[PDB]
Amino acid sequence: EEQGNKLHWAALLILMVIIPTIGGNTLVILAVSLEKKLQYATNYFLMSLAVADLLVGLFVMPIALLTIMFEAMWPLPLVLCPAWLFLDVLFSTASIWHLCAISVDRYIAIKKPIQANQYNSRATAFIKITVVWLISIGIAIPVPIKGIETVDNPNNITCVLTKERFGDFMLFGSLAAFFTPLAIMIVTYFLTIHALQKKAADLEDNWETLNDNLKVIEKADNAAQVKDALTKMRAKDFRHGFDILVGQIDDALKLANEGKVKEAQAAAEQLKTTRNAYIQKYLQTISNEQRASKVLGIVFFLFLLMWCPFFITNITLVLCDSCNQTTLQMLLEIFVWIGYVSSGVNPLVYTLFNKTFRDAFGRYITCNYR
């Protein structure tokens, strides 16, 4: 009885994990770098996430792949062991916290439509990116500092974190790298649902007010009613609609003061084609916001879902004393790769819902770059 040979698994992983990861993230980086249209603040998150996922595919996965074909033994120099473990925890944690930063960033966009200057957005973006990387470095730093337990005649050292030396880090590190942002994203999810629901209402409320007052105006016999039902209505591109409407209200009110109801009611008629222009525009944005938020929700949920097996089994392998550790480890060795896949192809799947990105990709796969 023997372990056997796992060459076919290695081949499989090279085919359906590493290549997808590298190719996908490369495409995203190329897209953002080449396309002028795509060079705005919020896409710099994506580029930062892409690099993180790209580096996992270049430096982390192939070593993880080596360790699979040479047992617990560590063929590389010992010094590269804590380094590989550092980069692994670093990049993996970064990809998760990146999605949390995007989630919250997108919520604030919906809630606070104003204050969206690109000039500020770029700086603010960079700051956020840097914070995410700082949080990642923070979470990953215990590994190299603690070091690995160290030889007789040869070196029989296995490159792995032990439950005796890193049980806490595994527990609190898991809490820090996965469950915290998960909670944050859940809260953000519900805040976003509430935000949109709230947004939809106020619009219908103002529609109602306008319609009601216009109804009052169009049936008015005297001037007092017209003048009365006009002040109630009086309550860069954003302020333009305000100036226009308020201007028209004042124009009609100026006629109402004159006592020319026939003129005012006619001026009020023009307000219909005016409200229909801004209500139909404002009511259109929330639709896109809703569709977008739904897509991001599903996609991000799938990402989070594919990481559960690892961190849950991780904490269980630490806490559960009665559980069979052999099977738990055997499971972990798979769940690690399921996680690698998750983070590996995430940015691509996400950006594939954008026509610009998607077209760019289509042009890049045929090797045009023009």
Ligand X SMILES: CCCCCCCC/C=C\CCCCCCCC(=O)OC[C@H](O)CO
Ligand Y SMILES: CN1C[C@H](C(=O)N[C@]2(C)O[C@@]3(O)[C@@H]4CCCN4C(=O)[C@H](Cc4ccccc4)N3C2=O)C=C2c3cccc4[nH]cc(c34)C[C@H]21
Ligand Z SMILES: CC(C)CCC[C@@H](C)[C@H]1CC[C@H]2[C@@H]3CC=C4C[C@@H](O)CC[C@]4(C)[C@H]3CC[C@]12C
Ligand U SMILES: CCCCCCCC/C=C\CCCCCCCC(=O)O
Ligand V SMILES: CCCCCCCCCCCCCCCCCC(=O)OC[C@H](CO)OC(=O)CCCCCCCCCCCCCCCCC
Binding mask 97-136 for ligand U (x = CB under 6 A): ------------------------------------x---
Site for ligand U contains 17 (CB under 6 A): yes
Distance CA 32, CA 11 (A): 31
Q: How many residues bind ligand X (CB under 6 A)?
A: 33
> Under a CB-based contact definition with an 8 Å cutoff, are residues 281 and 316 in contact?
no
Neighbouring C-beta atoms of residue 172, cutoff 10 Å: 12
Please select the residue that binds ligand U; options are 25, 48, 93, 103, rule is CB under 6 A: 48
**Over the range 187-212, which residues count as b (16 or more CB within 10 Å of their CB) and which as e?**
ebbebbeebbeebeeeeeeeeeebee
DSSP 71: T
Among ligand X, ligand Z, ligand U, none, residue 269 binds (CB under 5-8 Å by kind) = none
* Interatomic CA distance for residues 57 and 78, integer angstroms: 21
Q: Are 356 and 37 in contact (CB under 8 A)?
A: yes
Burial class (CB in 10 A: 0-12, 13-18, 19+), 216: middle
Residue 303 within binding range of ligand Y, rule CB under 6 A: no
Least separation in angstroms between residue 184's CB and ligand V is 8
Rounded Cα distance, 95 and 178, in Å: 10
DSSP 41: T
Residues 136, 51: Cα–Cα separation, whole Å: 14
Residue 159 region, left (φ>0) first, then alpha (ψ -120 to 50), else beta?
beta
78: contact with ligand Y by CB under 6 A: no
For residues 162-201, which are near ligand Y according to CB under 6 A? 162-163, 166-167, 170, 173-174, 177
Q: Report the C-alpha gap between 28 and 348 in whole angstroms.
A: 7
Q: What does the per-residue mask of binding to ligand V show for 75-114, with x meaning CB under 6 A?
A: ----------------------------------------
Near ligand Z in 280-319, by CB under 6 A: none
The binding track of 330-369 with respect to ligand Z, each residue x by CB under 6 A or -, is ----------------------------------xx-x--
Distances (CA, A) of 73 to 145, 157, 171, 186, 278: 22, 6, 25, 41, 67
Kindly state the number of chain residues that form the binding site for ligand U, as judged by CB under 6 A. Answer: 14
Letters for 178-217 (x = contact with ligand V by CB under 6 A, - = none) are -----x--xx--xx--x-----------------------
Of 193 and 330, nearer to ligand Y (C-beta) is 330
Least CB distance from residue 349 to ligand U, whole Å?
10
Q: Is 16 in the site for ligand U (CB under 6 A)?
A: yes
- List contacts with ligand Z (CB under 6 A): 14, 18-19, 22-23, 26-27, 364-365, 367
Where on the chain is the footprint of ligand U (CB under 6 A)? 6, 9, 16-17, 20, 47-48, 51, 133, 333-334, 337-338, 341
